[PDB]
Amino acid sequence: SREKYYITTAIAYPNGKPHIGHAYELIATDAMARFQRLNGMDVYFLTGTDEHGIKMLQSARKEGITPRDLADRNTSAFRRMAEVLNSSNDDYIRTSEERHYKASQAIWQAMVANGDIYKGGYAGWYSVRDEAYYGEEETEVRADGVRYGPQGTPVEWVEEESYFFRLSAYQDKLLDLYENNPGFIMPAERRNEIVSFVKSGLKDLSISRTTFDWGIPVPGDEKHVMYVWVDALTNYITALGYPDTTDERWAYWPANAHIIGKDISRFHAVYWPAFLMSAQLPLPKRVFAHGFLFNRIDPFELVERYGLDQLRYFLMREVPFGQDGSYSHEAIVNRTNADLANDLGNLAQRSLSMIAKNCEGKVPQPGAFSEADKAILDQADAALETARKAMDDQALHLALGAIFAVVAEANRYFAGQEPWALRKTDPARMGTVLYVTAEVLRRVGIMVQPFIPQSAEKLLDILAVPADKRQFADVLASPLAGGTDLPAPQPVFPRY
Ligand SMILES: COc1cc(Cl)cc(CNCCCNC(=O)Nc2ccccc2)c1
């Protein structure tokens, strides 16, 4: 019985087209999910779309179609993005689906049963100019006879009927969660902003609207529809068949990792665990927030220009996962050409071309390993353990850095050994250097699979590695057998 691993992306708002922020999140989470599959886990990987709300109703009114029709049309682009990005998601969740309507209504009833939902209103001062709420003390009536907020704009007393979740009851329980799980909300900078926020006191949370019907109705009060909080976050349990706990997929709960953007960190580390606690459900083991990408841009055009695995590699390598980063035409071209086309690509071509020409297209029979041979072989084995430990802390750049440090060293190894000169001098020793090179390329090939799957598959194909020997366990246990026929080598990473 393989151990279970549930991982998710935050669900995208399909109000516009797919931006690069959505692509980045999906790529990172896809790589993590693939990594765990290869590491032996029973993986479930989810992504999807948040389709309700006032902005979506208004967009639909503008184009002269129903909100559902619009939701269908715009979400197809996000489905197509997942396909073009080579996403290995086992399901695609859409908030408009019946299964989500039932699951959101179920968790709402569970929270009503726990005594955490009441009907009331959100009565206070609102600045229409600042688009924010204020307490009375932050305001001041001026000579106008008009009340102003703290930013010098008028405020107006807005009053709207709303259901509330009793978030004020979960302060001490959430603080206990953070003390008992240091890794619940990462990276470290996110945690501190969450702990500081919860310490300063939590007020009860508005969870329904009366201003639009494009939403999930509130049970026993259909004039209200559910606001974003209960709707969007419940997608993670909808995908496992909630509220049916007899479903085969329900064993995947709790989620091992919710991968999200930094902007929605509060909603996944404060509101979401409070809801789960109220509904008598276990909490996710980690929420990891990534940073944003700036242009120092449409993900379909980037993939077409630079290549998919080139983009996947760059985003995961150059930006430390958690921090903000940049991408430019110059940076993508340089770093992919250097690491993929030159370092990994040419090392495969030079070595495997020598096997095709000098060793009759067969893996050479290796003799004794020198101290140089051992070092590069052991460094490749050690990269897997550094990669495993890094991926537990969502440090994708550190995983790729360790794997491509082996590639860089293997190039220096191959060059120092001078196999070309050994062809005349000592053919048997040439065979050993070429064996060692191919063997390191196999180990690297297996290890890079989650990050660059199609290109990794090609490399392993030209090493004649069978389909059932491409797990991480095969790095130590399934080395290349001398005498095996290899197909004619072709370049895996063409230069830009
Ligand atoms: C609820 O916290 C979030 C959870 C996830 Cl998984 C993702 C996000 C980020 N999505 C963008 C938010 C904009 N969408 C929105 O407000 N939808 C909405 C509005 C009213 C009623 C139901 C959904 C926010």
Residue numbers in the entry: 2 to 297, 309 to 508
Sentences from the paper on this structure:
Within the twenty aaRSs, methionyl-tRNA synthetase (MetRS) is especially interesting for it not only links tRNA with methionine for elongation in protein synthesis, but also links the initiator tRNA with methionine for protein synthesis. BmMetRS is characterized by the structural motifs typically found in MetRSs from other organisms: a Rossman fold catalytic domain (red), inserted connective peptide (CP) domain (blue), a stem-contact fold (SCF) domain (magenta), and an anti-codon binding α-helix bundle (green). Comparative sequence alignment data showed that BmMetRS clearly has one knuckle and is in the same MetRS1 family as TbMetRS.
We also identified 2 other compounds, 1415 and 1433, exhibiting ΔTms of 3.1°C and 2.5°C respectively. Compound 1312 IC50 value for BmMetRS determined using the aminoacylation assay was 6 nM compared to 272 nM for 1433 and 1657 nM for 1415. In the presence of inhibitors, BmMetRS crystallized in P1 with nearly identical unit cell dimensions despite differing crystallization conditions. In each structure there were three copies in the asymmetric unit that were roughly equivalent to each other with average internal RMSDs of 0.81, 0.35, 0.64 for 1312, 1415, and 1433 respectively. Tyr14, which in the SeMet-bound structure forms one face of the binding pocket, swings ~50° to open up the binding pocket deeper into the Rossman fold domain. This allows for Asp51 to make hydrogen bonds to the “urea-core” of each compound, coordinating the tail end into the newly opened pocket (quinolone pocket Fig 5). To accommodate each substituted phenyl groups of the inhibitors, Trp230 rotates out and away to create the necessary space.
